[PDB]
Amino acid sequence: LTNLADELASVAKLLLSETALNKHLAEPTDDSAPKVRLLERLLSDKVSAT
Amino acid sequence: TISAADIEGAIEDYVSSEEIGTVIDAGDGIAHVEGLPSV
């Protein structure tokens, strides 16, 4: 739980820093699988599975 | 949480990849449609 909280905080700070990344990840879209692919290509193995 | 510049390619992997948009609002003969990047 502590590790997950730290990783989520890091991801939130990253989204804050990467304004373009945050905008592209936040723009509404019906499809989700490409968003999942982008997220995995970003931090698939850097952070834990949860 | 080390993030490399390859993330840029990631979004490039997204931007480059029929199209159906969605009406987000409509009023007085004017509609607004989300999506349709190739329109």
Nearest to B11 among A14, A20, A28 (CB): A20
From which experimental method does this structure derive?
cryo-EM
A41·B13 Cβ contact <8 A: yes
Q: Hey, is B38 helix, strand or coil?
A: coil
B14·A24 Cβ contact <8 A: yes
A38·B13 Cβ contact <8 A: yes
**Residues ≥6 apart with Cβ < 8 Å to B33:** B21, B22, B23, B24
Chain A contact residues (CB < 8 Å to B): 7, 10-11, 13-14, 18, 20-21, 24, 28-30, 34, 37-38, 41-43, 46-47
B1·A30 Cβ contact <8 A: no
Question: B18 with A24: CB under 8 angstroms?
Answer: no
Alpha-helical runs (H) found in A2-49: 2-17, 19-26, 33-43
